[PDB]
Design a protein around this ligand. Sequence first.
Ligand code: HPA
Lengths: 233, 233, 233, 233, 233, 233
Amino acid sequence: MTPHINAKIGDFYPQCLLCGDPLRVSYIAKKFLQDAKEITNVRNMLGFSGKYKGKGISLMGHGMGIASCTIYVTELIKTYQVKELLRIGTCGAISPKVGLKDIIMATGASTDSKTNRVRFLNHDLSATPDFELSLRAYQTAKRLGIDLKIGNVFSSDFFYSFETHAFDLMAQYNHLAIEMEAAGLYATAMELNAKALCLCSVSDHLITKEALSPKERIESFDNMIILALEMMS
Amino acid sequence: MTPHINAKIGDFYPQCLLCGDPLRVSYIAKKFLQDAKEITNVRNMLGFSGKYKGKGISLMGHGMGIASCTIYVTELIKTYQVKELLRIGTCGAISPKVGLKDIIMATGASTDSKTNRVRFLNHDLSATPDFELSLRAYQTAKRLGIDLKIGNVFSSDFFYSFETHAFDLMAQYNHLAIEMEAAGLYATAMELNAKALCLCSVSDHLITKEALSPKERIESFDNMIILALEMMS
Amino acid sequence: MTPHINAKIGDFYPQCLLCGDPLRVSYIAKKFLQDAKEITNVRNMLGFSGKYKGKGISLMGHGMGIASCTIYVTELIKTYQVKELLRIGTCGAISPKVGLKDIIMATGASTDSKTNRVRFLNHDLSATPDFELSLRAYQTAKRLGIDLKIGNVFSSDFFYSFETHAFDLMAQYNHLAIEMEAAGLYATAMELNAKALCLCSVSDHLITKEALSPKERIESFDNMIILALEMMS
Amino acid sequence: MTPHINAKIGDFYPQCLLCGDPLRVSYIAKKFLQDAKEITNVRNMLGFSGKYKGKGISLMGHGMGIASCTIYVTELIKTYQVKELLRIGTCGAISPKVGLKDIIMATGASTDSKTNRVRFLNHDLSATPDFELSLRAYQTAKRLGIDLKIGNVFSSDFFYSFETHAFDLMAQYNHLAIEMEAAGLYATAMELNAKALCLCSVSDHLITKEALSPKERIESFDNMIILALEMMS
Amino acid sequence: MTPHINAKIGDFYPQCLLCGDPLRVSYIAKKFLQDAKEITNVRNMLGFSGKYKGKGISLMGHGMGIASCTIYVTELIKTYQVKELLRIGTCGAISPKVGLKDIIMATGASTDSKTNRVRFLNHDLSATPDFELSLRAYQTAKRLGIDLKIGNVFSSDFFYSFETHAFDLMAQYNHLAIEMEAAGLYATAMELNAKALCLCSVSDHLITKEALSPKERIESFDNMIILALEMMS
Amino acid sequence: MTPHINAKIGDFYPQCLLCGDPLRVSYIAKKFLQDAKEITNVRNMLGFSGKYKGKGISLMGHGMGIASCTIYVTELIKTYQVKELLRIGTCGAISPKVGLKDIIMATGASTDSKTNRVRFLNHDLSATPDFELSLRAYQTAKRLGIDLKIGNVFSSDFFYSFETHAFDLMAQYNHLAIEMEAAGLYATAMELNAKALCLCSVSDHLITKEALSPKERIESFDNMIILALEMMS
Ligand code: HPA
């Protein structure tokens, strides 16, 4: 009933977990939820509803990049009444103060996109998450015994960067890692008065080149999954 | 080998078709290819290698928006030696010179993205297709009896535009339609010394708000797929 | 030991409270601090060192605007070894979600300045405070029974705005009020790896035109001075 | 009848050739046209109407730089009803793919000018020729056994560049040569719904530093002159 | 020899008058100079040397627009050792403070070009004339009983503007008239350590549309010619 | 009468000297004026009225940075009917040609601020003083035998520059020094139709690293002060 979601109205709980990869959403729905039901699949972009420790929770893939993430979040909020958008994914660390398996909470999302200057008077929009959600994330991680890393991320239009020489200046200004959506998620949620947070686990270090093995990857993504479901409980 | 395609090095023919929607890809594999093999499925983004009248050809989804398109197109060219990239898809008409069913050949792709300024000295990159390819498309459509409409497209980061007041100016400067990736397709192929072209089928006119019925939407999309397969013959 | 500060090295405590107006700094010192000494007075810009419940506190004025603020923040951090910088002041509200007497915590500072494009690759810097400082403010407010309003502010180069028509768009994107230094404070503290936060008291509401009287302005600000002081004990 | 052109209305044929230098224009008329007459001479910028193998063709000089080109082209289309504009001139080649005596067809014109941002919403306008004209140039060229070199051109505001370090990157993005008008020609033609094409003779590299001798300039340019007159016949 | 001037080295005197129209340069040579000879004529862009009441002086055309002006004045300074460049021409008035026949001395030249951002770190270059020259023009005007209007001009890349709605804001900021080269003359003279000045005669009013009779233009331009020659005396 | 000035009606004379430092302002009052009265002191920013050689003159502090100077200058013109604003401040030299406590007259003020693009259509505002005021400076300085350098200054948002590599380019374009308010003064005075001029004494040399002290920045500048007083006589 939107050009990118074929769910029925009401099929989404007001809390939604987000990933770029629709197959990760699938993995989460099978392994971590009871009574999960696939509710959308336009363009193979999967969404699910189901229960986690008795509470209703929703999952939704959103593709890669600001433009794509912006499409699905816009529809999720405007048509399907999602109110809290918690978003999890991987990132390449650029700071010396984070390493493999760390979970980063993005209190800001810088960007090389033009999307926010187009949204916001051609000025600098400081794209930021909802504070109460970050507080629930901080509190839950302490309780779970996770050493939550906290700082800005840089949301890039480029997976294959042309500005790799600038990563140290980004790290100087407290950017812990690079991904590709958070500035879009945060700006859209600000645009539509909804609540958003982004969480990112370190799977590679772009400076010193250490990398997780493909099943070390899955163990640390699981650690992040559990943190996310726990803070929505 | 790449973080977004799980094909083996050697599975792609040098010619490749592209669509945002990977479900479009499999529909073309089934209904039009012989010996259609699936060769990649990372993040549900399906790819296919098959046969059309005895000649090899590939298919590949690339998701929505410039950032996603660039990732897949960069990896196709750099890792899988793809040489000719032909993008087909839908687009929103903005010009009185076009209506529903029309197929548009994009001789240039303007954009509201900052990606080309980042790539290109913060100047104006004129994002354009390979000429030889555009000639094939013109001759094939003449041989096939298709009244090819030719002009610019505007590639936007926004599906839900904040600048609809501007569509009239775009149309005046010979922009026939809007979509969300061609400027990225063209600049990547320009960057990596490969050949590229973008074809667009008109499904919705954004000015008159005419829309095709899905009985014609499959009808017109087939016309375009055939034109594209023909010019790769 | 800098062109703009004539204190002795060591005169500053590592926690420093900031106001634009040096006479506000003079007030706080005389009314709320023990054994307050004046440590700097270049350009009539007063800084102080004293105690509050036995614990050392410093105070410093920074003038109006990002450029003036940046000058003093840089010198405090670099020459005088200050580690936490807490800014408190007034602000014009622009959001319906806040009214007179409200204290705002700025979890992000947007801007019409070019300073952060100059510092940060001509990209978008998301200027954010230190998280631990923000959590300390949330907990101290809760303990004092203060109803903290959390969101962005907008830091302008213009007190006399040429863009008043834009305040509705800023409010929509969760900018709760307008002032003139937070973006430079946050970016300088980001640049030099120090901890910073901004707190804003609503005395005027730029949209609904409500306003506190001179005696209610004094009363309201005092409520913010005590939260700040309580935050540092 | 316009401030920059002296001709009576109807003096111009609907197909017009353009050079930057009005002495090229006078040269073309006396060696290749029959019954040729000077129709305009404001600011010494010569224009001619004449006959080539029976068919009436016009010639018009336009000066150097986008702003100059834009003045003349604007008056040709709006006042004197020229419909097709074929620009022929020299350029400095920057790509290894082209060498001396080569004729470049500019299928896109990049630029360091701000004019197209001012024309086009401060976005990227991809400035492009009319496809049909470019195909006629390709078909004519091959009929005359001229191997056309095809790609993008960079239209600069600077003859004495301050960014010579950037030429390698421009060449990477398929810019074959540098000149100073094409992006202004294409944009204006797009604005005013006219058909336009730029052709460029490789007199001088800029990288190799190879410059052909006095004898050859005349010969290579005449070659482009015949190409131009033939696709207009 | 330079690409755009075929004068002998040593042909120019160190003081040069400039006009965009080479036929204006010819007119001044024949009417006001003693023993004037033509020294250059590339691209029909005439230059002259001669004497004014016994003292040597040169005249040079430079076409229209910043790019064209910049080519010629660069070559005048670096190759032909011209030291003082005084540009005379017409403009369109935009301010109610000036009328027809008024002579404007441009103490600053704003622009919509990108050329000064390209020259100067993408900041704002304040393009200004040489102070001593503007003093000499002030004094000579007084001597001649000419009432000199003094202010900024706006140097536009557009003769046919797309921002006529902005003319009033320009006039508010002390822009007396619009023309097309002064920002380039000024920035090039600044780049190359020469002395430049621009004087403008009001032929037309862009707001109230008043105009001089082409009989009253010839007379008013003459006054400006005499001012320029005399201040070189 | 404004939120930043609390002077009585008519407390300001129509001529007003400006400093960034209100203590340099106070030092001029107490040393040079008869009947010196302090007419404002909001935020410790001192303004004074008094008499010099019989004629009544005012003095006003404006803080550091374009934003602060705009606030005070805007209020001086709109509420206190100041007509002539003469800034006499400090600046850092960026040439060996220029020594400490040299006095510069800024015929133009370039900037890295975005304030003038915000004010002026996102084009290049050429920020210049009132000519007659600068002629007064020139003739006054000469009658007094006070030496005066004349050129542009660069008005930065940054006292601690992040672009020290650019100083030679700035000096190349006739920028004699760096300061932080002249572009703000000049723009505001252009906006509101008032007469402004900026003089500045070299208080630092940015190549060789000499710097005066806070007290020397009040007391080493008598010649500039006397120059200002005399030109207002
Ligand atoms: O170095 C400087 N930069 C800016 N303003 C100044 N005022 C004195 N020195 C300086």
